[PDB]
Every structure is written in C-alpha cells, then in structure tokens.
C-alpha cells in the first residue's frame, strides 16, 4: 500500500502466425452497442 512510479506499457503484445498459405475465418459473431 503505497505510491509507485513506473514506465508506461504500450499494451498487450502478440505476434500473428503469418504464413504464405494460411488463412483464418471467423465462425461466429457478437452484436455490440457503443456510446458517443
């Protein structure tokens, strides 16, 4: 329980499994509602 000072993290990190004869196609969907 204190106050800390760190360096910012830009976000989550991942790598896409890129290949020259591979494709990914979704099999479902979701309906979302936003506010503005």
């Amino acid at each position: 329980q204190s106050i800390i000072a760190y360096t910012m993290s830009l976000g989550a990190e991942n790598s896409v499994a890129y290949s020259n004869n591979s494709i990914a196609i979704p099999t479902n969907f979701t309906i979302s509602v936003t506010t503005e």
Partner: protein
C-alpha cells in the same frame, strides 16, 4: 434470428447499467457548463477590485472626494472594467467557435449514421456498422451505435486458384479453403463452406502464369441430368 435478437436485447440492457454505475461518463457535457460558470463567476468577482483607486465602490469615491480629484479615479476604474469585459467577450468568441466545430460533426454523424449505413471505418463505433439510434441530453446528443464484431476464428489452408483440365478457376465472391483433404468455397466474413462448382467460379487463362495454383476437381451440374434422361 433468435440468437441475434437475444444478443441485441442483452446489449441494450447492459447500456443503462454501464451509464449509471460508472460515473463521469458525461464529462464532455459537464466541462462546457463548468467552464461557462467559471468564466461568468470570474467576470462578476472582478467588480471588487480597485485597480489602484482608493476604493472599489463608486458611491464612496464620489462622496469623500471632490469631482476634480474624482475624474481620475473614475477614469481608472472605467479603464479597468472595460479591459476586464473585453477578455471575457474574446474568450466567449473562441469557445463558441470550438462548439460550432463540435456541433457540425454531430450533424454529420446524425445524417450519415442514423439516416443510412456508414461504410467508413471507425466513423460510427468499433466494428462493422449496422445501425444507430439518437438520444437527447441536457446540452448535447447521445448516439447508441450497434455494430458487428466477429469471434471464434479458426485457421485453414488456402490457394489462389484451382487448376482443372488445363484451366485456372478463381472464386467469384469468396475464398478457397481446406479442412485437410477437401476444398471448399466460403465467404470471407463467415465460415459457410460450399462444394466447388462451375457456378461460383470463373475461368481466366491457364495454370502456368499463376504461382501457387493447386489441383482439384470442379463439379459440373450437367453431369447427372444427362444420366437422368434416358
């Protein structure tokens, strides 16, 4: 249809809870009110300053001082108050110029997202736009953007073209995929595979120029009708 209706109902149920439970959701609408109130209060409070005169209120200045020695103090006070009014007017002009630019965007969004369907990405929501609904606010407008987000993806192997009888076949409005041995045609935004047929593919050229072409068979609808007719 039933699943989509249930998802829409649940999503429109969640929004009231999100607005109520989470505070400071309408900070944008409240900042302008706070700024206007602060500017007006600063303008009113600037009437208690003397700007070097012996007093702020004019009554005592005119009372305890002779007119020849009062035409200087009154002039100084007038100069101070005019300079205090000018800045308020200018800041109001700048804020109005900002609000006009913020309202032109609202008019554009209403016209191009409520009365139609938007094709420009990230203009109305995060995802593929379907529809939106407007709601009023104390000094603004609230849009509820309904979007389409894909999920539950799986990976296949693909080919750009299919070689058959020395001809290259390209899909019309889909892609060629494979579940390990067979080949199908599916739409790009959703997995609905169909058998490869000369109906959903077109022929252009041969199998030498294209690189990455594979081998398979293309079904012909005329095969069984010939055998059916004796």
């Amino acid at each position: 249809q039933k699943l989509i209706a249930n998802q829409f109902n649940s999503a429109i149920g969640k929004i009231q809870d999100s607005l109520s439970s989470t505070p400071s959701a309408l900070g944008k609408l409240q900042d302008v009110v706070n700024q206007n109130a602060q500017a007006l209060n600063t303008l009113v409070k600037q009437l208690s300053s003397n700007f070097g005169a012996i007093s702020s209120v004019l009554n005592d200045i005119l009372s305890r001082l002779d007119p020849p020695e009062a035409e200087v103090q009154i002039d100084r006070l007038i100069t101070g108050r005019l300079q205090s009014l000018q800045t308020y007017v200018t800041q109001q002009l700048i804020r109005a110029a900002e609000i006009r630019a913020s309202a032109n965007l609202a008019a554009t969004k209403m016209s191009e997202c409520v009365l139609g369907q938007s094709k420009r990405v990230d203009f109305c929501g995060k995802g593929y736009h379907l529809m939106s609904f407007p709601q009023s606010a104390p000094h603004g407008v609230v849009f509820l953007h309904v979007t389409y987000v894909p999920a539950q993806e799986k990976n296949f192997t693909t080919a750009p073209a299919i070689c058959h009888d020395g001809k290259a076949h390209f899909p019309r409005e889909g892609v060629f995929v494979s579940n390990g041995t067979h080949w199908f045609v599916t739409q790009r935004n959703f997995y609905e595979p169909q058998i490869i047929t000369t109906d959903n593919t077109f022929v252009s050229g041969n199998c030498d120029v294209v690189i990455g072409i594979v081998n398979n068979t293309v079904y012909d609808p005329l095969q069984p009708e010939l055998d059916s007719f004796k």
